[PDB]
Amino acid sequence: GDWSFLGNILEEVNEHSTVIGRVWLTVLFIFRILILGTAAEFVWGDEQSDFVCNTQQPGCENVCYDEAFPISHIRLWVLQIIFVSTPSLVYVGHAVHHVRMEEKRRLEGTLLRTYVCHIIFKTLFEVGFIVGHYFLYGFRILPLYRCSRWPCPNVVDCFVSRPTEKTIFILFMLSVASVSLFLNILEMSHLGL
Amino acid sequence: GDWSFLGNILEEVNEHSTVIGRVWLTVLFIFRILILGTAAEFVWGDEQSDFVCNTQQPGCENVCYDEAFPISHIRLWVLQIIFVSTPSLVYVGHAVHHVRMEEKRRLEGTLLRTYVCHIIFKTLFEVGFIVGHYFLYGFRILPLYRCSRWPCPNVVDCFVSRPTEKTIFILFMLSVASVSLFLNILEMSHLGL
Amino acid sequence: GDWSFLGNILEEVNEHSTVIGRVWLTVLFIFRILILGTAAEFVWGDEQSDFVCNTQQPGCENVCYDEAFPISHIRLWVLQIIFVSTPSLVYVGHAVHHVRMEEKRRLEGTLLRTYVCHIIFKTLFEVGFIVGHYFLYGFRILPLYRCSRWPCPNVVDCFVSRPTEKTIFILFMLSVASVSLFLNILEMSHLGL
Amino acid sequence: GDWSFLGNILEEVNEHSTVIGRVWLTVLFIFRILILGTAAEFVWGDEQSDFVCNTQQPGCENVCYDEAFPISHIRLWVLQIIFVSTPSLVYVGHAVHHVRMEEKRRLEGTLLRTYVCHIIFKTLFEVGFIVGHYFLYGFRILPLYRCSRWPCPNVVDCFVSRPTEKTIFILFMLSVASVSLFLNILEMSHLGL
Amino acid sequence: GDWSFLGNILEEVNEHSTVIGRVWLTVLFIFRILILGTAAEFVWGDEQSDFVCNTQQPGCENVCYDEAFPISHIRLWVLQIIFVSTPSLVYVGHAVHHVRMEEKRRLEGTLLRTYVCHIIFKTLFEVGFIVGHYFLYGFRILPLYRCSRWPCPNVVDCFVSRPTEKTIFILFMLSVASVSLFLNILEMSHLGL
Amino acid sequence: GDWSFLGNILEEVNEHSTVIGRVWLTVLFIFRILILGTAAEFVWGDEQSDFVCNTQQPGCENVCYDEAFPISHIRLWVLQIIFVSTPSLVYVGHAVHHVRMEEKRRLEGTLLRTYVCHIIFKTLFEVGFIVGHYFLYGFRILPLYRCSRWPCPNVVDCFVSRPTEKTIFILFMLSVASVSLFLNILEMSHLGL
């Protein structure tokens, strides 16, 4: 997809942020969005097309693929990016609002609170998405999925496409998110000092 | 699709709008257009291709898919975006017209009325599209669709692609639209004060 | 497709036009080109691929699809856009020519005539395309097409893809074109006064 | 394909050209490149995929499609555009060369000759491509192609995809090219006066 | 593919080059890259998909297609473009280096040598790629390919997609490369004088 | 994929780097990213679709393709590019930080250390990816892959798509990486002097 607008706003943010914050935005762009667009999206391109179940029951493949993957990982990661970005948008909006107010007439006591809260919310969203991914899928995609969802007769064997590659990228994204967390915590500590 | 032109005009609007209004435009861009383009459009990509009916009647799949999905959700959402955007275009056009008039020779009594009416119309279109979606599809896509449309013999079983993921995104868009409504109402209240 | 160049010229026109004219160009961009690119083109994407005829005669599907859809609606609409845009290009060219002439050495008596004629021609092309669409396809796409074109033996039953959605968008475009006509007529009246 | 670079150069040309010449470049952009990119290329998208021959001889479809369409119309039109554009590039290069020469130290006697010759060559290339198209394909694509090319046993019947639509666009392009010719001739006459 | 970056650098080169050199870069852009992107890449799009062998041996089509086309022509041409472009990059880098050196503190004796060597290397790479193409594929793609590569039993008949069109474009590219050579030689002669 | 953002940052780096460093960035752009996007990605486009195994066991093709290619080469190369680029981002960030610090109030003793370490890390990542590729795949892709992974009965024969072309590009990328190493070493030596 096209991320140009979000990139515009976030680049604008870069100016109004801590050094750790600029590192965080660089990470967001390079190791999440770029990889999604150029590496991961191709990996999941044939997720359902090459999902194959050992049966001749009509509709069994559509229901078994939907059971194994209620939301695809790539879409989960899209949502994750958007939600961890939103607070930064809030903060830069507050900043530009104060700027226009001063013109009509940096991290002051008024902004500081908003900035800290935005770091806090980035952290909360990151942790939430990581936990949700863990419970939904674990962190490994196994090649065999056994499904007993109607209309499938008894339990059928279905086989996932590219399970090892998908696992590699799952773990890669997990690590990127953990790095984001570390950065957020160090930024809170730096402000504290 | 390419939304660049609409984005140009709406970015122009951002200047001539209330703080709540700028939040609303940010929402429009990030949580509706971006998601459509990068997440939802892939979800619905194989909507008809992976729609499968248990029959060997020719033409039964084309007529049963058309019965279940008279308009696809993604196209409904496109139309929604365009129609909720139009009033903002009207208002910014009025603004630039007054600007050129003054040059030849902010929210004044002349504009205020137009602005309030444009908020009102955004609200009406949002509510209308939400209601229309509810009656057309409810808010859950079930995996099994039973169809009795000619040429299908008797009632046939057809199976939808990615029903759970489509449901997730349906609800997501519903929530985004509700947030838009709340923003519009708070903007009317703010003007009232 | 890529409409960037036409958009450049037409944006240039926006300056040299009446307020109604700027509304007309806004409509052209938002409700015709954007929709084509992001909504309609996907609807017609599988027009022939999912066109299915009840026969085992080779070549019957290629000849029956060509009979039902001699020109696809999307291409008809492309041509329509281009032809209703051309006169505006003529007028802005005349304007820039007079500008360069004056530099070497707004709606004057010389331009006024050209402007009125360009409105007239926009109107004629719009009416012509609407009428042509009516005679070629009516304004509803029915699900069943019966074809007796060689090599098909006797009359065969063919089934169209996405007939209801295609009908929705057909009517939508009809309405957009009618709005364009109303705008053109009001612009002629405004000039008359 | 991406025509951006050629568009850059030709837009640069627009300044250094006659009024008829600017009309010609506008035509080139709007009625040839835009249509190719947004209308015609989709029409020919499934040219070979939906080419079907009544046989069960392996390789018969690959050899019969190659016999009927040695070069596809869309690629012929691409080449046409490039070759009718080249002379304009030559002329603008000569112009910028004289400009730099004068700086180191409009249609003069030196340029006039080059300009006239470039018009002449545009005309020659246009006529050549039109004639070549006529002999290669006539100007109508018939639905049935009968092929006797090895490995096909005896004469086989093959059926073309979208013959009527392809015919419509063939004639459209023919008309565009004829308009280009008329423009070139009027430009020569205008210079003559 | 996206050639934007290379285009940036080469456009930068245009300033620092002979008139013949600017012609050469214009050729590179218009008659090699543009054609690849808009004409040739579609021709080779279904190269393997529509490659068909008369056999029911599994794996025979994958091994026979790989034998006939060890590297596809389009990728060969990509590499060719990149390698004939590299020396121009070297030269413009040398130029900007001397510029920065002079600022800290045209074709001089220092640059002249580098320029001549870069022309020489362009020529060598062009000749090498032309010769390599000749030995790898001749200059005509025949419709029938006979393959005896394991697992195929005995010799099997395989049929190429679009052989005549591919031949047309092969010869076209050969001619473009020969024109490049002529330009390089004339540039060396011009410098010599 | 879209590499625009990374390209922005790296172009920014070009200014703050040694001449050898600018050569290295030019290589990165032209011989790694451009080739990936325009040549290699098409080569691997049908990697799994045209992967064929001699069996009628369901799921055997999905598990045998995943065994032969746990990560596809193209994605490996993407990751490689990103990781060899990261240190340059670190260094330019340090540079801009010192710039802003000086404004509030080239290769100095403070920067020199960071620069040398960033060269060192580029080298380490390059060597690591080269070694990892060697152990994962060797440097030749053979046409036949024999797989005994459940559910396949006994050992089955699977046939790779485009093995010779993939081998050519594998070796090409190996050579590009080796050139990068040589450049890094010469840059360390140059600094040492």
mmCIF file with all atom_site columns, C-alpha atoms in Angstrom, chain A residues 23-166:
data_model
loop_
_atom_site.group_PDB
_atom_site.id
_atom_site.type_symbol
_atom_site.label_atom_id
_atom_site.label_alt_id
_atom_site.label_comp_id
_atom_site.label_asym_id
_atom_site.label_entity_id
_atom_site.label_seq_id
_atom_site.pdbx_PDB_ins_code
_atom_site.Cartn_x
_atom_site.Cartn_y
_atom_site.Cartn_z
_atom_site.occupancy
_atom_site.B_iso_or_equiv
_atom_site.pdbx_formal_charge
_atom_site.auth_seq_id
_atom_site.auth_comp_id
_atom_site.auth_asym_id
_atom_site.auth_atom_id
_atom_site.pdbx_PDB_model_num
ATOM 1   C CA . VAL A 1 23  ? 15.788  6.780   16.172 1.00 0.00 ? 23  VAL A CA 1
ATOM 2   C CA . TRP A 1 24  ? 12.351  5.316   16.851 1.00 0.00 ? 24  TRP A CA 1
ATOM 3   C CA . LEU A 1 25  ? 10.846  6.950   13.768 1.00 0.00 ? 25  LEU A CA 1
ATOM 4   C CA . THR A 1 26  ? 13.787  5.776   11.659 1.00 0.00 ? 26  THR A CA 1
ATOM 5   C CA . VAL A 1 27  ? 13.163  2.231   12.902 1.00 0.00 ? 27  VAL A CA 1
ATOM 6   C CA . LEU A 1 28  ? 9.437   2.545   12.188 1.00 0.00 ? 28  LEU A CA 1
ATOM 7   C CA . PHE A 1 29  ? 10.151  3.538   8.600  1.00 0.00 ? 29  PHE A CA 1
ATOM 8   C CA . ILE A 1 30  ? 13.048  1.249   7.702  1.00 0.00 ? 30  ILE A CA 1
ATOM 9   C CA . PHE A 1 31  ? 12.421  -1.967  9.628  1.00 0.00 ? 31  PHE A CA 1
ATOM 10  C CA . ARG A 1 32  ? 8.601   -2.102  9.630  1.00 0.00 ? 32  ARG A CA 1
ATOM 11  C CA . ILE A 1 33  ? 7.062   -0.285  6.647  1.00 0.00 ? 33  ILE A CA 1
ATOM 12  C CA . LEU A 1 34  ? 9.806   -0.897  4.097  1.00 0.00 ? 34  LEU A CA 1
ATOM 13  C CA . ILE A 1 35  ? 10.017  -4.598  4.941  1.00 0.00 ? 35  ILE A CA 1
ATOM 14  C CA . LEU A 1 36  ? 6.243   -5.022  4.828  1.00 0.00 ? 36  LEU A CA 1
ATOM 15  C CA . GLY A 1 37  ? 6.130   -3.376  1.423  1.00 0.00 ? 37  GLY A CA 1
ATOM 16  C CA . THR A 1 38  ? 9.136   -5.018  -0.219 1.00 0.00 ? 38  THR A CA 1
ATOM 17  C CA . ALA A 1 39  ? 9.611   -8.360  1.587  1.00 0.00 ? 39  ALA A CA 1
ATOM 18  C CA . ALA A 1 40  ? 6.695   -9.548  3.727  1.00 0.00 ? 40  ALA A CA 1
ATOM 19  C CA . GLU A 1 41  ? 3.779   -8.710  1.477  1.00 0.00 ? 41  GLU A CA 1
ATOM 20  C CA . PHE A 1 42  ? 5.160   -10.995 -1.284 1.00 0.00 ? 42  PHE A CA 1
ATOM 21  C CA . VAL A 1 43  ? 5.662   -13.806 1.259  1.00 0.00 ? 43  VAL A CA 1
ATOM 22  C CA . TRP A 1 44  ? 1.959   -13.728 2.197  1.00 0.00 ? 44  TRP A CA 1
ATOM 23  C CA . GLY A 1 45  ? 0.816   -12.998 -1.402 1.00 0.00 ? 45  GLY A CA 1
ATOM 24  C CA . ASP A 1 46  ? -0.291  -16.642 -2.118 1.00 0.00 ? 46  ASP A CA 1
ATOM 25  C CA . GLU A 1 47  ? -1.407  -17.370 1.506  1.00 0.00 ? 47  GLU A CA 1
ATOM 26  C CA . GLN A 1 48  ? -4.870  -18.702 0.563  1.00 0.00 ? 48  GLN A CA 1
ATOM 27  C CA . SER A 1 49  ? -4.197  -19.597 -3.077 1.00 0.00 ? 49  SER A CA 1
ATOM 28  C CA . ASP A 1 50  ? -1.512  -22.132 -2.105 1.00 0.00 ? 50  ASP A CA 1
ATOM 29  C CA . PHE A 1 51  ? -3.367  -23.306 1.024  1.00 0.00 ? 51  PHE A CA 1
ATOM 30  C CA . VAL A 1 52  ? -4.274  -26.912 0.219  1.00 0.00 ? 52  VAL A CA 1
ATOM 31  C CA . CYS A 1 53  ? -6.455  -29.367 2.142  1.00 0.00 ? 53  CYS A CA 1
ATOM 32  C CA . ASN A 1 54  ? -6.618  -33.125 1.596  1.00 0.00 ? 54  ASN A CA 1
ATOM 33  C CA . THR A 1 55  ? -10.313 -33.482 0.811  1.00 0.00 ? 55  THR A CA 1
ATOM 34  C CA . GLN A 1 56  ? -12.777 -33.242 -2.038 1.00 0.00 ? 56  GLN A CA 1
ATOM 35  C CA . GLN A 1 57  ? -15.425 -31.549 0.079  1.00 0.00 ? 57  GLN A CA 1
ATOM 36  C CA . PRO A 1 58  ? -16.551 -28.239 -1.469 1.00 0.00 ? 58  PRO A CA 1
ATOM 37  C CA . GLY A 1 59  ? -16.099 -25.281 0.820  1.00 0.00 ? 59  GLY A CA 1
ATOM 38  C CA . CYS A 1 60  ? -13.760 -27.172 3.142  1.00 0.00 ? 60  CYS A CA 1
ATOM 39  C CA . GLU A 1 61  ? -10.680 -25.183 2.006  1.00 0.00 ? 61  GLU A CA 1
ATOM 40  C CA . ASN A 1 62  ? -12.428 -21.736 2.386  1.00 0.00 ? 62  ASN A CA 1
ATOM 41  C CA . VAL A 1 63  ? -13.615 -22.561 6.026  1.00 0.00 ? 63  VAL A CA 1
ATOM 42  C CA . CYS A 1 64  ? -10.280 -24.285 7.137  1.00 0.00 ? 64  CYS A CA 1
ATOM 43  C CA . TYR A 1 65  ? -8.143  -21.355 5.795  1.00 0.00 ? 65  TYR A CA 1
ATOM 44  C CA . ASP A 1 66  ? -10.439 -18.841 7.629  1.00 0.00 ? 66  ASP A CA 1
ATOM 45  C CA . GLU A 1 67  ? -10.121 -20.970 10.879 1.00 0.00 ? 67  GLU A CA 1
ATOM 46  C CA . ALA A 1 68  ? -6.301  -21.152 10.744 1.00 0.00 ? 68  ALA A CA 1
ATOM 47  C CA . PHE A 1 69  ? -5.840  -17.436 9.835  1.00 0.00 ? 69  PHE A CA 1
ATOM 48  C CA . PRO A 1 70  ? -8.747  -15.341 11.161 1.00 0.00 ? 70  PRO A CA 1
ATOM 49  C CA . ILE A 1 71  ? -6.640  -12.181 10.448 1.00 0.00 ? 71  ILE A CA 1
ATOM 50  C CA . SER A 1 72  ? -3.531  -12.438 8.302  1.00 0.00 ? 72  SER A CA 1
ATOM 51  C CA . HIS A 1 73  ? -0.243  -11.455 9.944  1.00 0.00 ? 73  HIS A CA 1
ATOM 52  C CA . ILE A 1 74  ? 0.439   -8.702  7.393  1.00 0.00 ? 74  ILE A CA 1
ATOM 53  C CA . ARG A 1 75  ? -2.842  -6.931  8.162  1.00 0.00 ? 75  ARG A CA 1
ATOM 54  C CA . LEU A 1 76  ? -2.196  -7.299  11.905 1.00 0.00 ? 76  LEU A CA 1
ATOM 55  C CA . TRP A 1 77  ? 1.155   -5.556  11.364 1.00 0.00 ? 77  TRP A CA 1
ATOM 56  C CA . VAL A 1 78  ? -0.446  -2.758  9.335  1.00 0.00 ? 78  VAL A CA 1
ATOM 57  C CA . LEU A 1 79  ? -2.893  -2.043  12.157 1.00 0.00 ? 79  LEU A CA 1
ATOM 58  C CA . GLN A 1 80  ? -0.008  -2.196  14.650 1.00 0.00 ? 80  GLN A CA 1
ATOM 59  C CA . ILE A 1 81  ? 1.959   0.442   12.734 1.00 0.00 ? 81  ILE A CA 1
ATOM 60  C CA . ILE A 1 82  ? -1.022  2.777   12.471 1.00 0.00 ? 82  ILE A CA 1
ATOM 61  C CA . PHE A 1 83  ? -1.867  2.540   16.160 1.00 0.00 ? 83  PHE A CA 1
ATOM 62  C CA . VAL A 1 84  ? 1.681   3.026   17.422 1.00 0.00 ? 84  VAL A CA 1
ATOM 63  C CA . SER A 1 85  ? 1.931   6.053   15.122 1.00 0.00 ? 85  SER A CA 1
ATOM 64  C CA . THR A 1 86  ? -1.286  7.837   16.191 1.00 0.00 ? 86  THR A CA 1
ATOM 65  C CA . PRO A 1 87  ? 0.056   9.297   19.500 1.00 0.00 ? 87  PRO A CA 1
ATOM 66  C CA . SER A 1 88  ? 2.958   10.964  17.706 1.00 0.00 ? 88  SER A CA 1
ATOM 67  C CA . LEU A 1 89  ? 0.360   12.633  15.491 1.00 0.00 ? 89  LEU A CA 1
ATOM 68  C CA . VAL A 1 90  ? -1.495  13.837  18.586 1.00 0.00 ? 90  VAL A CA 1
ATOM 69  C CA . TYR A 1 91  ? 1.684   15.345  20.019 1.00 0.00 ? 91  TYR A CA 1
ATOM 70  C CA . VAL A 1 92  ? 2.782   17.129  16.849 1.00 0.00 ? 92  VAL A CA 1
ATOM 71  C CA . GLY A 1 93  ? -0.739  18.517  16.511 1.00 0.00 ? 93  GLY A CA 1
ATOM 72  C CA . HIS A 1 94  ? -0.541  19.940  20.023 1.00 0.00 ? 94  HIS A CA 1
ATOM 73  C CA . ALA A 1 95  ? 2.834   21.449  19.112 1.00 0.00 ? 95  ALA A CA 1
ATOM 74  C CA . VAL A 1 96  ? 1.620   23.161  15.939 1.00 0.00 ? 96  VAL A CA 1
ATOM 75  C CA . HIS A 1 97  ? -1.427  24.401  17.851 1.00 0.00 ? 97  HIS A CA 1
ATOM 76  C CA . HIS A 1 98  ? 0.764   26.104  20.449 1.00 0.00 ? 98  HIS A CA 1
ATOM 77  C CA . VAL A 1 99  ? 2.909   27.514  17.632 1.00 0.00 ? 99  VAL A CA 1
ATOM 78  C CA . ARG A 1 100 ? -0.074  29.122  15.914 1.00 0.00 ? 100 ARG A CA 1
ATOM 79  C CA . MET A 1 101 ? -1.311  30.406  19.274 1.00 0.00 ? 101 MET A CA 1
ATOM 80  C CA . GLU A 1 102 ? 2.024   32.098  19.956 1.00 0.00 ? 102 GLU A CA 1
ATOM 81  C CA . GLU A 1 103 ? 2.070   33.577  16.446 1.00 0.00 ? 103 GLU A CA 1
ATOM 82  C CA . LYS A 1 104 ? -1.425  35.068  16.770 1.00 0.00 ? 104 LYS A CA 1
ATOM 83  C CA . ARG A 1 105 ? -0.493  36.896  19.982 1.00 0.00 ? 105 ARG A CA 1
ATOM 84  C CA . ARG A 1 106 ? 10.603  23.752  23.504 1.00 0.00 ? 106 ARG A CA 1
ATOM 85  C CA . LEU A 1 107 ? 9.397   20.989  25.839 1.00 0.00 ? 107 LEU A CA 1
ATOM 86  C CA . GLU A 1 108 ? 7.652   23.323  28.252 1.00 0.00 ? 108 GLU A CA 1
ATOM 87  C CA . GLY A 1 109 ? 5.614   22.222  31.247 1.00 0.00 ? 109 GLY A CA 1
ATOM 88  C CA . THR A 1 110 ? 2.521   22.127  29.042 1.00 0.00 ? 110 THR A CA 1
ATOM 89  C CA . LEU A 1 111 ? 4.000   19.923  26.311 1.00 0.00 ? 111 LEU A CA 1
ATOM 90  C CA . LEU A 1 112 ? 6.130   17.704  28.571 1.00 0.00 ? 112 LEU A CA 1
ATOM 91  C CA . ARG A 1 113 ? 3.024   16.040  30.009 1.00 0.00 ? 113 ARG A CA 1
ATOM 92  C CA . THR A 1 114 ? 1.567   15.316  26.565 1.00 0.00 ? 114 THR A CA 1
ATOM 93  C CA . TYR A 1 115 ? 4.916   14.013  25.305 1.00 0.00 ? 115 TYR A CA 1
ATOM 94  C CA . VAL A 1 116 ? 5.339   11.628  28.235 1.00 0.00 ? 116 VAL A CA 1
ATOM 95  C CA . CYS A 1 117 ? 1.763   10.396  27.823 1.00 0.00 ? 117 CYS A CA 1
ATOM 96  C CA . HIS A 1 118 ? 2.336   9.801   24.105 1.00 0.00 ? 118 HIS A CA 1
ATOM 97  C CA . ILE A 1 119 ? 5.435   7.727   24.849 1.00 0.00 ? 119 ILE A CA 1
ATOM 98  C CA . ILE A 1 120 ? 3.364   5.821   27.406 1.00 0.00 ? 120 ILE A CA 1
ATOM 99  C CA . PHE A 1 121 ? 0.632   5.093   24.867 1.00 0.00 ? 121 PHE A CA 1
ATOM 100 C CA . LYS A 1 122 ? 3.102   4.001   22.189 1.00 0.00 ? 122 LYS A CA 1
ATOM 101 C CA . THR A 1 123 ? 4.416   1.549   24.778 1.00 0.00 ? 123 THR A CA 1
ATOM 102 C CA . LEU A 1 124 ? 0.946   0.295   25.715 1.00 0.00 ? 124 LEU A CA 1
ATOM 103 C CA . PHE A 1 125 ? -0.077  -0.286  22.092 1.00 0.00 ? 125 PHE A CA 1
ATOM 104 C CA . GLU A 1 126 ? 3.190   -2.082  21.314 1.00 0.00 ? 126 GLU A CA 1
ATOM 105 C CA . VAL A 1 127 ? 2.814   -4.397  24.303 1.00 0.00 ? 127 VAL A CA 1
ATOM 106 C CA . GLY A 1 128 ? -0.828  -5.040  23.477 1.00 0.00 ? 128 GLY A CA 1
ATOM 107 C CA . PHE A 1 129 ? -0.163  -6.012  19.878 1.00 0.00 ? 129 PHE A CA 1
ATOM 108 C CA . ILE A 1 130 ? 2.746   -8.265  20.871 1.00 0.00 ? 130 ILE A CA 1
ATOM 109 C CA . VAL A 1 131 ? 0.614   -10.067 23.471 1.00 0.00 ? 131 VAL A CA 1
ATOM 110 C CA . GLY A 1 132 ? -2.329  -10.375 21.097 1.00 0.00 ? 132 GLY A CA 1
ATOM 111 C CA . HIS A 1 133 ? -0.102  -11.880 18.420 1.00 0.00 ? 133 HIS A CA 1
ATOM 112 C CA . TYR A 1 134 ? 1.277   -14.372 20.931 1.00 0.00 ? 134 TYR A CA 1
ATOM 113 C CA . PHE A 1 135 ? -2.141  -15.638 21.973 1.00 0.00 ? 135 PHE A CA 1
ATOM 114 C CA . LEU A 1 136 ? -3.612  -15.617 18.426 1.00 0.00 ? 136 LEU A CA 1
ATOM 115 C CA . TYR A 1 137 ? -0.659  -17.489 16.687 1.00 0.00 ? 137 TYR A CA 1
ATOM 116 C CA . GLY A 1 138 ? 2.143   -18.221 19.095 1.00 0.00 ? 138 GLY A CA 1
ATOM 117 C CA . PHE A 1 139 ? 5.340   -17.261 17.299 1.00 0.00 ? 139 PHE A CA 1
ATOM 118 C CA . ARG A 1 140 ? 5.794   -20.271 14.922 1.00 0.00 ? 140 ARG A CA 1
ATOM 119 C CA . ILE A 1 141 ? 3.647   -21.219 11.885 1.00 0.00 ? 141 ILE A CA 1
ATOM 120 C CA . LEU A 1 142 ? 3.585   -25.017 11.601 1.00 0.00 ? 142 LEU A CA 1
ATOM 121 C CA . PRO A 1 143 ? 3.237   -26.603 8.135  1.00 0.00 ? 143 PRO A CA 1
ATOM 122 C CA . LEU A 1 144 ? 0.280   -28.900 9.047  1.00 0.00 ? 144 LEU A CA 1
ATOM 123 C CA . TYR A 1 145 ? -3.094  -27.503 10.151 1.00 0.00 ? 145 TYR A CA 1
ATOM 124 C CA . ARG A 1 146 ? -5.762  -30.047 11.144 1.00 0.00 ? 146 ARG A CA 1
ATOM 125 C CA . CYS A 1 147 ? -9.335  -28.701 10.740 1.00 0.00 ? 147 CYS A CA 1
ATOM 126 C CA . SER A 1 148 ? -12.751 -30.043 11.810 1.00 0.00 ? 148 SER A CA 1
ATOM 127 C CA . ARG A 1 149 ? -14.921 -27.060 10.791 1.00 0.00 ? 149 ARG A CA 1
ATOM 128 C CA . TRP A 1 150 ? -18.178 -27.674 8.964  1.00 0.00 ? 150 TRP A CA 1
ATOM 129 C CA . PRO A 1 151 ? -18.486 -28.639 6.023  1.00 0.00 ? 151 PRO A CA 1
ATOM 130 C CA . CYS A 1 152 ? -15.286 -30.688 6.390  1.00 0.00 ? 152 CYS A CA 1
ATOM 131 C CA . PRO A 1 153 ? -16.119 -34.365 7.102  1.00 0.00 ? 153 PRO A CA 1
ATOM 132 C CA . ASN A 1 154 ? -14.323 -35.573 10.345 1.00 0.00 ? 154 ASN A CA 1
ATOM 133 C CA . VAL A 1 155 ? -10.746 -33.798 10.785 1.00 0.00 ? 155 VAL A CA 1
ATOM 134 C CA . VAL A 1 156 ? -8.939  -32.905 7.484  1.00 0.00 ? 156 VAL A CA 1
ATOM 135 C CA . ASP A 1 157 ? -5.266  -32.122 6.862  1.00 0.00 ? 157 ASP A CA 1
ATOM 136 C CA . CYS A 1 158 ? -4.480  -28.701 5.390  1.00 0.00 ? 158 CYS A CA 1
ATOM 137 C CA . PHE A 1 159 ? -1.020  -27.469 4.453  1.00 0.00 ? 159 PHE A CA 1
ATOM 138 C CA . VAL A 1 160 ? 0.202   -23.907 4.853  1.00 0.00 ? 160 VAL A CA 1
ATOM 139 C CA . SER A 1 161 ? 2.233   -22.010 2.274  1.00 0.00 ? 161 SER A CA 1
ATOM 140 C CA . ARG A 1 162 ? 5.770   -20.897 3.123  1.00 0.00 ? 162 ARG A CA 1
ATOM 141 C CA . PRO A 1 163 ? 5.608   -21.709 6.860  1.00 0.00 ? 163 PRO A CA 1
ATOM 142 C CA . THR A 1 164 ? 9.356   -21.395 7.574  1.00 0.00 ? 164 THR A CA 1
ATOM 143 C CA . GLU A 1 165 ? 9.730   -18.045 5.781  1.00 0.00 ? 165 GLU A CA 1
ATOM 144 C CA . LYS A 1 166 ? 6.619   -16.708 7.496  1.00 0.00 ? 166 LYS A CA 1
#
